[PDB]
Design a protein around this motif. Structure first.
Motif, short mmCIF file in Angstrom:
data_model
loop_
_atom_site.label_atom_id
_atom_site.label_comp_id
_atom_site.label_asym_id
_atom_site.label_seq_id
_atom_site.Cartn_x
_atom_site.Cartn_y
_atom_site.Cartn_z
N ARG A 211 2.18 -11.16 17.29
CA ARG A 211 0.95 -10.35 17.55
C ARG A 211 0.79 -9.16 16.59
NH1 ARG A 211 -1.55 -11.07 22.51
NH2 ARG A 211 -2.25 -8.88 22.39
N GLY A 212 1.88 -8.43 16.34
CA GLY A 212 1.90 -7.35 15.37
C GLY A 212 1.56 -7.85 13.99
N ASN A 213 2.12 -9.01 13.61
CA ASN A 213 1.79 -9.60 12.30
C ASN A 213 0.30 -10.01 12.24
OD1 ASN A 213 5.05 -11.26 11.76
ND2 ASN A 213 4.30 -9.30 10.92
N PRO B 289 5.44 -10.10 21.00
CA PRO B 289 5.12 -8.86 20.28
C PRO B 289 5.17 -8.96 18.75
CG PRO B 289 6.66 -8.42 22.12
CD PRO B 289 6.46 -9.91 22.06
N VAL B 290 6.12 -9.70 18.19
CA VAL B 290 6.26 -9.74 16.73
C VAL B 290 5.12 -10.47 16.02
CG1 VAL B 290 7.70 -10.62 14.82
CG2 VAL B 290 8.72 -9.49 16.80
N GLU C 214 -10.57 -7.40 20.79
CA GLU C 214 -9.35 -7.40 21.62
C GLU C 214 -9.68 -7.40 23.11
OE1 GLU C 214 -5.70 -6.52 20.73
OE2 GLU C 214 -5.89 -5.65 18.74
N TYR C 215 -10.79 -6.77 23.45
CA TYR C 215 -11.25 -6.76 24.81
C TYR C 215 -11.60 -8.21 25.19
CZ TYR C 215 -14.32 -6.70 28.82
OH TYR C 215 -14.90 -6.99 30.04
N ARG D 187 -2.12 -8.53 13.95
CA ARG D 187 -2.91 -7.29 13.81
C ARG D 187 -2.86 -6.73 12.41
NH1 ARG D 187 -0.84 -5.99 19.37
NH2 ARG D 187 -2.62 -6.24 20.76
N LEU D 188 -1.66 -6.77 11.80
CA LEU D 188 -1.48 -6.34 10.44
C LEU D 188 -2.36 -7.12 9.48
CD1 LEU D 188 0.54 -4.34 8.85
CD2 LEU D 188 1.79 -6.47 8.29
N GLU E 69 -16.84 -0.50 18.05
CA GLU E 69 -15.85 -0.83 17.01
C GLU E 69 -15.49 -2.32 17.15
OE1 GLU E 69 -12.06 -1.40 16.35
OE2 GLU E 69 -13.13 -1.70 14.46
N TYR F 226 0.82 -1.21 0.00
CA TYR F 226 0.00 0.00 0.00
C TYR F 226 0.85 1.27 0.00
CZ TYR F 226 -2.87 -3.70 2.02
OH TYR F 226 -3.49 -4.91 2.27
N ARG G 65 -9.00 -3.89 4.75
CA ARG G 65 -8.99 -2.98 3.62
C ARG G 65 -9.09 -3.72 2.26
NH1 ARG G 65 -3.81 0.86 2.92
NH2 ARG G 65 -5.21 1.37 1.19
N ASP G 66 -8.51 -4.92 2.16
CA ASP G 66 -8.53 -5.70 0.89
C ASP G 66 -9.83 -6.49 0.62
OD1 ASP G 66 -5.87 -4.82 0.91
OD2 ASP G 66 -5.03 -6.83 1.05
N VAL H 65 -11.93 -3.20 18.67
CA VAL H 65 -11.81 -2.87 20.09
C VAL H 65 -12.51 -3.96 20.92
CG1 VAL H 65 -12.47 -1.29 21.87
CG2 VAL H 65 -11.65 -0.39 19.69
N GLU I 288 4.17 -3.11 23.25
CA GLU I 288 4.37 -4.47 23.73
C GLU I 288 5.85 -4.87 23.67
OE1 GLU I 288 1.67 -7.11 21.53
OE2 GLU I 288 -0.10 -6.07 22.28
N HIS J 227 -5.81 -5.90 9.69
CA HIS J 227 -5.91 -4.65 8.91
C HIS J 227 -6.03 -4.90 7.40
CE1 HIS J 227 -5.08 -0.73 7.27
NE2 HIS J 227 -3.93 -1.14 6.76
N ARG J 228 -5.18 -5.79 6.88
CA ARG J 228 -5.23 -6.16 5.48
C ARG J 228 -6.53 -6.87 5.07
NH1 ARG J 228 -0.17 -8.31 2.49
NH2 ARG J 228 -1.61 -7.61 0.83
#
Lengths: 206, 200
Positions: B87-89, B84-85, B68-69, B91-92, B62, A52, B99-100, B65, A77, B95-96
Motif C-alpha cells: 500500500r505504501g509503495n 502496509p508495505v 481513497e475515500y 501511494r508512493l 482533493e 528526488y 510530480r513526474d 482524498v 497502518e 505521488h511520483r
C-alpha cells in the motif's frame, strides 16, 4: 551487502516535514535510527533510494518511502497502536481532508516565510495571513481536546510542528487565541511530542 | 445518490469519474465550468475546487482524498493492496505519477504558461513515459497485477497524449498494449465525458 536492514529515517532536524514523521514515530513508540541530513549535502545511501533526495525518507529492509503523508500513513497502518486515524471511511476522509487543508492553508504559508528565496512582500504577507488564520480557527480549540477531534491523530502531527515554530516564523498569537494557546501548552508537554524534538528544534524556543 | 462536481475536461476530475466507474457506484455527475463556480459547491468547498464529492453530511475534495475515500467506502472491487508495505509503495507511485507526469501534463495544458515551458514539458513527459514502457511487460496493470488507484492516476494522462502533442515510439509496445486493453475496459469507457471522447 550493506543495504538497509533496520528501520531508519533520514530526517532534517530543522525541517517541519521531518518533524511530522519524527512525531508519528514517537507516538508509535517504535525503534528507529534517526539519520540527520544536511539539505545541501545529501548522503549517498539516500540518493540511491530517493531520486528526488527529499526528507523525510523512511527506510527498512526492502522499503524506501518518502513524502511525509505516504510515510505517516505507512506508519499508521504498519503500527496500529495507538491509533492516529479514525477507522471508518467518512471520519477517515474528514481527517485526510483536514491534513490537506493544514498543508495548503498553513504549512504552505510557513514554508513561504522560512524560504530565503521569498521576496520581502511574500514573507510579510504570508506571516500576517498565517497569524490571522490561526487566530480565526482558535475558537474551535474549545470544542475538542485535540484539533477537530478528542483524539491524538495525524492531523495533530501535521499541525504541531508549525505551532512549535511560531517564534521562528515571527508570529505571536493574541489573547483571544487562548484556546489554541491552551492546546499548544497541553500538546508540547506530552511525552511523545517532547521525544520528537531534535536539539535544533528545542533551541527554537526558550 | 452520491453527487460529484466534475470538470468534464479536467484530468483530475477524470481520476474520480474513473474510480466511481470501477466501483460501479450510482452517482449524480454535475458538470462544472471552471470560469463559473456553482453556489452549491462554494457552500461545501471553500476553495471552489473539482472534483468534489458530496453525500449527506459529507464533502470531500482533493482528488487523492476523494479516491481513497471511494476505495474505503465501496471496498469491491479493491483498488489498493491490503498490506502496509505494498500500500505504501502504491501511494508512493501515485505521488511520483503526480510530480513526474501529471505536473508536466498540467504545464502543457495551462493557458497561462509560456511557450517554452510547454515545449520542455512535452519532451520531458514523452521521454519518461517511453523509458518506463518496459515495466508494462512485467505486470497486467501499472506495477501490479490488480487494477489500482495507480492506474486511475495514470490513465487520464495516457488518454490525453494526443491533446498533449505526444506520440509514443513504436518500441513502447507494452505501454501501448496496456492502453489498448485499458481503454476498452467497461469502467474506463463509462468514465469518459463527451469532451474527453473528442480528444481522440
Amino acid at each position: 551487502l550493506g543495504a538497509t536492514n533496520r528501520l531508519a529515517c533520514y530526517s532534517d532536524p530543522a525541517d517541519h516535514y521531518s518533524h511530522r514523521v519524527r512525531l508519528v514515530l514517537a507516538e508509535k513508540g517504535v525503534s528507529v535510527q534517526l539519520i540527520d541530513v544536511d539539505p545541501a549535502h545529501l548522503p549517498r545511501k539516500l540518493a540511491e533510494v530517493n531520486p528526488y533526495g527529499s526528507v523525510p525518507t523512511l527506510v527498512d529492509r526492502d522499503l524506501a518511502l518518502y513524502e511525509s503523508t505516504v510515510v505517516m500513513e505507512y506508519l499508521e497502518e504498519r503500527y496500529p497502536h495507538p491509533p492516529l486515524m479514525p477507522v471508518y471511511p467518512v471520519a477517515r476522509g474528514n481527517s485526510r481532508l483536514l491534513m490537506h487543508r493544514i498543508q495548503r492553508d498553513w504549512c504552505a504559508l510557513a514554508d513561504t516565510v522560512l524560504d530565503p528565496r521569498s521576496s520581502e512582500a511574500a514573507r510579510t504577507e504570508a506571516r500576517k495571513a498565517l497569524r490571522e488564520s490561526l487566530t480565526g480557527v482558535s475558537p474551535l480549540f474549545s470544542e475538542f481536546a485535540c484539533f477537530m477531534s478528542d483524539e491524538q491523530s495525524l492531523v495533530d502531527c501535521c499541525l504541531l510542528p508549525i505551532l512549535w515554530r511560531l517564534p521562528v516564523l515571527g508570529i505571536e498569537l493574541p489573547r483571544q487565541a487562548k484556546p489554541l494557546l491552551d492546546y499548544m501548552e497541553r500538546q508540547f508537554a506530552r511525552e511523545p511530542f517532547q521525544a520528537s524534538l531534535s536539539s535544533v528544534e528545542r533551541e527554537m524556543r526558550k
